């Protein structure tokens, strides 16, 4: 079971970002609920930003013109078409730019989960290159939770890890 570098997990259902483990006591998936909630807060504000900007106060009810008011009719048509072209442009461009930034945002955040793990494990685990780390020391459920919580006690497992490393 490889991580983010090869593809996603269909076995992880409680958040967008998270962890998977295999240990003596068992295995499974669990979400990183703080990285996921912060990502959600960001995305929710982004969705609302799109909604708030596109505020329509425009009246499109048309007007009739006479046979001798063609210049006015054509000016009115030009105005309606010009505003439509501009708003169509703005709506499409805003959505494409935001979709691209959103995908980069999420890719950045999964990378950050990876980096905050190697910054704790350091030489106590082998970085594999498939989005996972192999602890040199034997690790139980309590140290797995400790790494996920950002509280890993590196010194505590340093001697065992060195011997195996």
């Amino acid at each position: 079971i490889a991580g983010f570098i090869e593809g996603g997990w269909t076995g992880m259902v409680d958040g967008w970002y998270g962890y998977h483990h295999q240990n003596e006591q068992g295995s499974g998936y669990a979400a990183d609920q703080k990285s996921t909630q912060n990502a959600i807060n960001g995305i929710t504000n982004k969705v609302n930003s799109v909604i708030e900007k596109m505020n329509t106060q425009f009246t499109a009810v048309g007007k009739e013109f006479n046979k001798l008011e063609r210049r006015m009719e054509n000016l009115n048509k030009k105005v309606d078409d010009g505003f439509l072209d501009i708003w169509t442009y703005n709506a499409e461009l805003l959505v494409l730019l935001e979709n691209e930034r959103t995908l980069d945002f999420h890719d950045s955040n999964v990378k950050n989960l990876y980096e905050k793990v190697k910054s704790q494990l350091k030489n106590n685990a082998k970085e594999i290159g498939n989005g996972c780390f192999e602890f040199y020391h034997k690790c139980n459920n309590e140290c797995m939770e400790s790494v996920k919580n950002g509280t890993y006690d590196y010194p505590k497992y340093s001697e065992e890890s060195k011997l195996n490393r």
Partner: antibody, heavy 118, light 108 residues
Framework: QVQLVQSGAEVKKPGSSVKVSCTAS????????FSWVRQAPGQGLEWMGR???????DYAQKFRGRVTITADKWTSTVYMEVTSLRSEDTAVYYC??????????????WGRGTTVTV | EIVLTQSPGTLSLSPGERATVSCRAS???????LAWYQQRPGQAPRLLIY???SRATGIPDRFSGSGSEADFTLTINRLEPEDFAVYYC?????????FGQGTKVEIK
Amino acid sequence: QVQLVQSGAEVKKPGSSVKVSCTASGGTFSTYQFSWVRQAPGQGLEWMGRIVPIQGMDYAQKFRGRVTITADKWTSTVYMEVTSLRSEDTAVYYCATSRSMYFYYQLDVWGRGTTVTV
Amino acid sequence: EIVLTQSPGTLSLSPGERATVSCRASQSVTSTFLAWYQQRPGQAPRLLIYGASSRATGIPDRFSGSGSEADFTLTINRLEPEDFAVYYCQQYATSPWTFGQGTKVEIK
């Protein structure tokens, strides 16, 4: 932080429908997920259904076909209509919103609730 | 469906004493989808714990909880006069969302 405001109490005769509502304030209505929860006198809480105005809706199966839950972003208000009322429908109906169950999380903002008598 | 059974229906203790409320699901449920609520008579439910264990904003250190699979517990240390209320077990993992009966705490 959202401040939900609810409508007053209702008294109905059997067979009629009741519409109750919650007004959201202090945030953007469209992305809040609004749940309706009922509590019969002397009983525990029961979930009836949920609306995410910009995304979709779901219902408790017991009320599917009797309860319609809708929303109006223009007045920031969520409505629930319960049809074919029966004498067991004497519960207090509350709104609550989730923290983030746009996608994944629990209910942490609650309104005061409105009593419906049948 | 996911069915939540709470126990005891009524818990009774001296103020300052520790209370626990048990909840058992009909099926195993990922802990991310559990929550606990406190309903003081005359009031709408307040969120205490979200997920099996995280405490909600504005809720004091007296409250904590944990569990796994189908078995979860709410812990209230040093229970105070304002905590003699009814606690509810709720899960949002699948539709329909489900609630337990509620556990009342009495003053003795």
